[PDB]
Structures are given as C-alpha cells and as structure tokens.
Design goal:
binds zinc ion; two-stranded antiparallel sheet; Erythroid Transcription Factor GATA-1, Chain A; DNA binding protein; DNA-binding; alpha+beta; dna binding protein/dna; homodimer; 2 strands; 73 residues
DNA sequence: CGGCGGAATTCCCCGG
DNA sequence: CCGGGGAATTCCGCCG
C-alpha cells in the first residue's frame, strides 16, 4: 500500500525523516555528504519515478529536500 | 579550427556514422542503436544536450543523434 | 600515412 | 560490501 514520497517506488520505511525506498535513502545520503552540485538538463520540474529517477539527480535531490529529508532527524 | 559535435556541441573527433561528432557521442549511438531502445525522458523531450548535461537524458541524446542523421550503414 | 569502426579498458553511479 | 551497467577514453584492425 505504501510508496516512496520521492520516486513513488515501494518504500522500505521512514528514512531521514521521510518515507522512502532504499535507493532514495542511499541516494540522499551520498548526495549530502558528497556536497554534490547537480545540474538539470530540463526545467527543474523533472518527473521522478522508478525508471526516470536515474536521469536527473538534481530534481531527485531537490525532491528529497522538499519532502523534508535531513541527516539529523 | 575548431569543429563541433552536431549532437552535444563538444569538440568533434571526426565524422562518425555519417555525422560530425565527438568520440563520446560516437560510442553512445553505437550502444543505443544496438540496445533495448526503450529510453525514457524525465522532461519534455527537449532536454539540453551538451558536454555537461549529455549524461542526464539518453532519450534526448539518442533523438538528437537520429535527427542529426547518424546511422550504422554510414 | 590518416580516418573510421569497434573492441577493450577504466571510471563511476546505482541499487540489492 | 558487491555486481551490473552506462559513460568515455584508449587501443587496435582495416582500408583508401
Ligand atoms: Zn524512492
Ligand atoms: Zn531535472
Ligand atoms: Zn558529442
Ligand atoms: Zn530528455
């Protein structure tokens, strides 16, 4: 019944404050500590789902932050 | 000098599969044309393809390859 | 020779 | 951790 609030894939639980799948959990972790600067090839509104989440780390990371994901939480 | 890749605008290494392109776009088209051919765009299918952003959308990059006229028979 | 196709190699993101 | 797979550079075979 329950889905990841970022990519809509089935969630593994509440990670960093937000209900997410394992891949988004690990992605957000790597993004914050990598101090990554991502660039969208689109309009920064990109569709993020199970398949398309690979395409735009920028919009995926943005969705993580907007969903409320945080390292200390 | 110089000449630019007609796909991503990076410097072109020569004429590959009929079109002036960089090395990276050469091997990309090779992989894509023999691949699963299912690529999906997360955008509006207008995604900007340049040296920085060409990794982001295989679908749009492949489309630009085709539009530029790239083919295996060349 | 130089140009092109292409395989091989290296690098890195992704996800189980 | 690990393996899978794409990206891009490197290296080689062929031919005009
Ligand atoms: Zn997710
Ligand atoms: Zn995007
Ligand atoms: Zn190119
Ligand atoms: Zn696109």
């Amino acid at each position: 019944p329950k889905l990841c609030l970022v990519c809509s894939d089935e969630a593994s639980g509440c990670h960093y404050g937000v209900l997410t799948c394992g891949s988004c959990k690990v992605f957000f972790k790597r993004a914050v500590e990598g101090q990554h600067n991502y660039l969208c090839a689109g309009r920064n509104d990109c569709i993020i789902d199970k398949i398309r989440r690979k395409n735009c780390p920028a919009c995926r990371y943005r969705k993580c932050l907007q969903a409320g994901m945080n390292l200390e939480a």
